[PDB]
Amino acid sequence: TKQYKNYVNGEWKLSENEIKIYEPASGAELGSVPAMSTEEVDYVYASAKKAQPAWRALSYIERAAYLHKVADILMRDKEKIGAILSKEVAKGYKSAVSEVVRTAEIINYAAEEGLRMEGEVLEGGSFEAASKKKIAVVRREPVGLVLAISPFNYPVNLAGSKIAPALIAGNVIAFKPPTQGSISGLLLAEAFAEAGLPAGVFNTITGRGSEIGDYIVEHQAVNFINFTGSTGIGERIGKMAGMRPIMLALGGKDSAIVLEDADLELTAKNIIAGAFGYSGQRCTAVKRVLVMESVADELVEKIREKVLALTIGNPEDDADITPLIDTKSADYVEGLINDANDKGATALTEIKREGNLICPILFDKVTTDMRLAWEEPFGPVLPIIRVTSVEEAIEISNKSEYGLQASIFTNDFPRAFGIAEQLEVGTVHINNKTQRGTDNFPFLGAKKSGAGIQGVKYSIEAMTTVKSVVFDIK
Amino acid sequence: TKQYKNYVNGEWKLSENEIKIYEPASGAELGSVPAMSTEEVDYVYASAKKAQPAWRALSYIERAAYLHKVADILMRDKEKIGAILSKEVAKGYKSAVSEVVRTAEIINYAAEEGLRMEGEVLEGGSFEAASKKKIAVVRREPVGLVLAISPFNYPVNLAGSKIAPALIAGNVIAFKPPTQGSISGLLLAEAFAEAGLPAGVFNTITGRGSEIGDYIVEHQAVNFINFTGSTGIGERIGKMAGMRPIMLALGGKDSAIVLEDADLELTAKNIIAGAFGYSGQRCTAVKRVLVMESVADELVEKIREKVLALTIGNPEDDADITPLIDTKSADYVEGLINDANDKGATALTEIKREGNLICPILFDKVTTDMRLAWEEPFGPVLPIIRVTSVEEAIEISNKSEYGLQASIFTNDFPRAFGIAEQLEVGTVHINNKTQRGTDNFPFLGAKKSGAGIQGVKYSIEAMTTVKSVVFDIK
Amino acid sequence: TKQYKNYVNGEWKLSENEIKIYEPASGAELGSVPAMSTEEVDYVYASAKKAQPAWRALSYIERAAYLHKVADILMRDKEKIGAILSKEVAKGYKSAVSEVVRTAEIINYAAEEGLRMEGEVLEGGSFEAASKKKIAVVRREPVGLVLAISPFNYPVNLAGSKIAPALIAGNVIAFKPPTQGSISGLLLAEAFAEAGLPAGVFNTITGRGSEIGDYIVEHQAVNFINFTGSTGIGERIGKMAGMRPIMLALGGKDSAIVLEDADLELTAKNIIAGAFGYSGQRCTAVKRVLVMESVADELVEKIREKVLALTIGNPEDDADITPLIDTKSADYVEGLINDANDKGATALTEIKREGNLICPILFDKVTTDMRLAWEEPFGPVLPIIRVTSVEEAIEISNKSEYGLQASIFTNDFPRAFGIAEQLEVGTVHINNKTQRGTDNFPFLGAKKSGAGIQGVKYSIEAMTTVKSVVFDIK
Amino acid sequence: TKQYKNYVNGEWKLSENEIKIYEPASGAELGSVPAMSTEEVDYVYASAKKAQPAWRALSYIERAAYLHKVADILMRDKEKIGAILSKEVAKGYKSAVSEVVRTAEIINYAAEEGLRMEGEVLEGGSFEAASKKKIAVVRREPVGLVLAISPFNYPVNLAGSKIAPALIAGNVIAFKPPTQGSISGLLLAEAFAEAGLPAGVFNTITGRGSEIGDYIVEHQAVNFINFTGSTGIGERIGKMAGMRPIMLALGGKDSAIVLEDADLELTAKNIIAGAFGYSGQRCTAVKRVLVMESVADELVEKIREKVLALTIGNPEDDADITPLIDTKSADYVEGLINDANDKGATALTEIKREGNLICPILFDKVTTDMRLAWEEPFGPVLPIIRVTSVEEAIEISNKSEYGLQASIFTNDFPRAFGIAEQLEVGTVHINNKTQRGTDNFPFLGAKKSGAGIQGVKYSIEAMTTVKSVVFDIK
């Protein structure tokens, strides 16, 4: 078996036990990753903690130089990395190479954003006359050791987005990728190893989350937990963090609200791209259409037609719709599909599953009584919900426990802004599908979708604290 | 004669000579103000300069308290002050009490904005590794003595908007109101006298600009010149400032661009209010309408009708259209009117002048060959210029030497934003008339409309410099 | 008994049950406060949640006006409130009126800071060329309902510091004061009632934390938990918060690091004031002195002498040392004293307790083996720990689980700055005692001393999130 | 003769007439640069104005890529460029290569600082209730065409420091190097040509300032003048700019204030390095020592001794002291030396001139009556002025018409900060010589030393304006 190793204190280490990884589309063995023991996790953390002071003592520009080197290596190796990633998570080849390119971009951008971090000088005389000579010189400091946890759908990009902002600020890292995506995670580690960051500054941890997951999070060496994944795990992490800071990006059931004055063709095009990209396996995917009754029939017909042009098949063929991550997930999606259909929603597409490959399906006239109106599928199934007012759309949208992003399609901008203000989400996109992008923009979820604000500069701010030095001028 | 005095080094001083001021509407004598000599100007400046160190030595909170007190005195005396102001500049009574209230508002806002001025800490390590222990502690400092010069149309407001931002930062002020408005100016000075700011911190200068103007500006005591007035004087101030910092708020020929999808009734209403407020004697007034041909006839008709609803008459009666500030001004407006008429423009309203009271006029079919298409009238005359494309509208708009603000009336917001990027102006108002409005918002002009950025925090920033203290941490 | 009521949805409500409050110094009964039931807590939250949308819909300026009005009432009532406060928490009368004045100040500052909150515009083109016309318009929004919990040592100030930053931003409040201080907290509520903030916008909750404590925190209506108090409770709150945002201000064991070149008289004076203020019942008190051996004897002598000049007695008599909050507390302190003494520490002052009034004690030759070297007493006892190097002082300082603040006394500033960087605390005061002081300055603790950054603007930032609206310019 | 060409609208152009350039140290011909006609200047400007809209239309990221490319070429050719720069301005070889490296750094830093420029969203509701739904979306825009003028002492570095901040923001450039330094300036142009910036975006102008100088500055195509040079020329530019924005970095006579508690060795080392670097031809050089009488003799001795260790000779030999830029300059410097000597100052070094190579001279006991007390020499001559108090030092320091920077040598930092606040300079360095670096730090002069703030981000802000888009949310 092709045995991958964790990167720990500047060395590559195998564990006594291993986890075999297979390609979700083909079933072919891809290799194995170590199933670390708690003692091995202890050594990672002790290694990072010992390296943190010297890493922090370096100048910002030196830390940036290291990150830029990592990003360069990723650019050079985008085809190598994308080829494996594509197979590991059944993501289209081109899309996987793209994920790597975006990872380098984020890493470069963080290096440069974090190198310009500035402090502030506050005046005691702003608050009290007797303190007019007292000033506070406030500078950012790292929180310490960051634990970064990435999800299967972007095992590399959503690791980089946490890692680089943490590192530029002087924090050290322990990176835990998802098990299905742990090889891609270790391929990312290679870049950090080749770049030559000092030993202990960047480290990886592998093993089943269901077995070492609580241990890595509960560990007292961890000063900050930065996680992307399911709402269920994220809730547990919230509790295990206790009073430690956290960044959580979790599930979504993003609504796309369509008013009577919408450009229906632009709406359908965006809805299709956002709903079906990566077979619906995105947190920010359009996951429910709240369309005013009067334009529904026309919009639905455009969606239906565009759904039929989606290619279906294998990762290597760059199909729009690839097989889902695993059996469990495809099973859960099919149950949601059956529930909708059994309850009487109107399927505009054929219901078909072959292995873990579910064919894209559109359900019209979905009601609040159907599971599919609420649950995040993470499969290529889209419900259309007909509404009779914008007030109803807002109510249905906000009734969700999720609040990541929303899309509003209309030609009435000032009104779209007024509706945005009422939507319990992080980001509202006007006349475009929802998306995390562009990476400098804030990325956050309301309610059960998240805690903390991401996007580059916000991640850096999240993973630093402040040191105030106060003195009197003579 | 009721003889007003200047506030100088905490005392009220008369001069050897005086200028009699008369009410523009009734011709009635209002009072007289001193006609200062160059030596008296010298004394104002030497007093201010002497007081500056101790005024800067106060805490921000102490300066803010003085400022809030001034604002409170203004609120208490709004009727007293607005009554005289109304008579001094032929401004509607209610509008004049309104100018005083806005002055108190700007003053209070500036006090609280300026008290929260923060500095920054920069890292040597952001730029070079060898300087990682070097930091720069950067704090704002006043420029010193500010010369504030207000125009006739807002003698009190456009004085407070310069003074309060100047003073909160620790600068000292020498305020020169316009001659026609100097009494109002001196009434404002009373508020500062009663608030009890230390002697020399705030002072006034009176005399004819055409005689002491160059002297007060060229004086080497002055560290900053903040002026609102004609483009003509503004240009001379630019040259006489030499390398000293300046704030110039000059004229405008604000265009109101009307697209085919505009809401015509809203457009007309905003156009009427913006073009005719204070008989068009505002820098930010809507001064030319660039309207798409297809909707022109309809929009023209609406404006015509609303023009007839405008009241005409005296200040005490709160008429919309009051007599112009002076003969010269009315004579200049009549010249533009005749040039447009004699060139073929269609006057939809009756051309009539009685004394200095000119009746509101709407001119249609104004071409680029007419003076009125370009020159700022400072009178109740509106030109309508029909275009056949947005591109044409943009070209014409930008062909002006002025560039204060523009209005865009459309229901296509993203396009409005795209257009706003191309307009050579400081502020673009979408579906609203142009306006200095909301004093916290930036206020600036491109090309011949200004230098520097106003609006509260921007004024504060303009009238402060920075003092950087660099040292190495051990 | 005088039976106080809670302010709930615009009404003053009593509960079935009540808790009787007694003066700690005299034992006299002060009155009673309600002991709310879980259903009454539910009513408070349901009322707040209902009032929130309309409170948010107001303009910043309107919410600020409400806040200023509250602070005005507090200034008017400072003696009435300080009188009771003094009795309820055995705080010197002048100190008590002072806390109320500081509260009004914090409230006004927050109103004015919060009203000026600004959003940002981010460019897609900063990150990717293809997104050059995409922009993000990011504005702050409230989190919703904030649960504010104040401690006994500043029941009113540490309530206002949470309340106003919360309300200015558009959040609603549920304030729970400490039981011993609940009357004072309810007196604060009177001001909010008189100010006339809409019903449900501001509400109080009373009851023993040990009984409704978890219930109020765990309630799903609460969107943010802002707490000051013990580290033990803070930890539990962190766990009960799950993934909801929190602000925790907990214990401290602030060290005062004295170098050989220190100004011993200045040092001694600051050490006395910080250590003994309010009988050592402040989170930020100087709690351990880490003095270089060579200057120890001289410094210790100066402290010893100054301790003897402290007044001991009742609240009404503005004594420096008042009786401790309760018996339990004084018993805890006495156990620390006995442990130090039994272990070999040299008490330079007499050990004496009468009721709950403990006389100020100076322990010299304290070792790391003594409980007093580590545990926060919250009583008038100061240990002196002699070190032989700055490095040692840094080690011992950082060895603590607390990290609120630190003092450094030296004439070598650049070195003091270098030491500050290494100290695991929020704020380092150079040549001054530690202090939350100047409320505009950031206030935070590292390690077990806290979570989140307080200080006005920081609290506002903490209790708001962002809403990003993204669109493409055409 | 090696004929250099100007880079204009993407082409390399010769002029009818040329200027021959000779090496200041050897007298050897170096090459010739064009002597442009007013018409050729007109073509540069028309070219840039035409290229501007399309350069602005690019994304920030694309403009940054071009700049980064330019920086890359400069690094690649640092020896080639430094070799000629060294010869052209008689700057030591390594120092010349060092100037090129610093230019690449500044270009890269500006590229990345500029790409992250963000806008602001202001709320009408902060100022007035009625305007609660109105917001201002404020974004930076370029000013248009920037005229950049560099000085002989850093013909390349002080070109790049103006050019890159201008270009990243979307401005176009016309670069006029100094005549003595025009070759190096054209070498810099080569890197912009090789980077492939579109035609007209970056252009050069060569000719004698005394002949086309006023022309290039008065030209109405120029939207901003960014100049580093003599105070004499800078004053004329101030006037010629009229109301157009400017950045002026002029002369300095930086004082190094030495207190009784100074570390005399560190003080002498810094004084020697700052005063004699590049033979005193630096705006930020230490130009006058204001030393407390009691430590004077000891400091003076240290300086005297360190002055003798300075190498004197040719550029190619990397001598500390090289020949001055020209005869006129060395003649001027000699006159200042003679005045000081004739007036009775104590020369601690021999007075010696061979060609234009003046040996480093230290004059003690300099009195306010000597020209050398006040005039900026731009030669290797240093006056020591003895004082009896810090107040006297401050008075003598501020009595100068220059106020670029100051140095304070002391072991009492809080006092140094109090002294800094009083010094009329832009930057005060504590226990270090004055210097423009690090380049992210602000760089500005008070009084006759400058107008505007430089240092990377400040340069970017100076050369951009704001476009405000106001609208009402529905």
Ligand SMILES: NC(=O)c1ccc[n+]([C@@H]2O[C@H](COP(=O)([O-])OP(=O)(O)OC[C@H]3O[C@@H](n4cnc5c(N)ncnc54)[C@H](OP(=O)(O)O)[C@@H]3O)[C@@H](O)[C@H]2O)c1
């Ligand atoms: N388009 C037009 O024909 C027209 C006509 C009238 C007004 N306006 C407009 O009026 C607004 C300001 O009006 P304004 O007539 O009060 O402007 P202004 O005559 O330029 O004067 C504004 C201020 O500058 C002072 N001043 C005059 N000469 C000066 C000098 N040499 N040096 C220093 N200060 C000097 C004035 O004092 P004195 O009052 O003592 O002169 C007054 O306080 C601008 O928008 C301008 O467009 C335009």
Ligand SMILES: NC(=O)c1ccc[n+]([C@@H]2O[C@H](COP(=O)([O-])OP(=O)(O)OC[C@H]3O[C@@H](n4cnc5c(N)ncnc54)[C@H](OP(=O)(O)O)[C@@H]3O)[C@@H](O)[C@H]2O)c1
């Ligand atoms: N060094 C010590 O051992 C010691 C002793 C006391 C205080 N302190 C310090 O003083 C500060 C805290 O003062 P404090 O004694 O007032 O502390 P505290 O008991 O933790 O309580 C602070 C606030 O939290 C409330 N609370 C108590 N239990 C709660 C629960 N389960 N859930 C939610 N809220 C709950 C309290 O209400 P109730 O009043 O109803 O309980 C009070 O309002 C910190 O420095 C701590 O270090 C230290």
Ligand SMILES: NC(=O)c1ccc[n+]([C@@H]2O[C@H](COP(=O)([O-])OP(=O)(O)OC[C@H]3O[C@@H](n4cnc5c(N)ncnc54)[C@H](OP(=O)(O)O)[C@@H]3O)[C@@H](O)[C@H]2O)c1
């Ligand atoms: N006080 C003194 O007597 C003295 C003497 C030497 C140096 N300095 C110091 O020298 C530094 C500047 O060096 P520098 O000698 O290169 O200064 P400078 O002669 O003022 O020239 C700086 C730049 O200005 C250009 N220039 C000259 N006349 C101009 C005009 N009318 N309009 C526009 N641009 C014009 C120059 O081109 P050309 O090269 O073709 O003219 C040059 O690139 C400052 O620190 C200054 O204080 C002072």
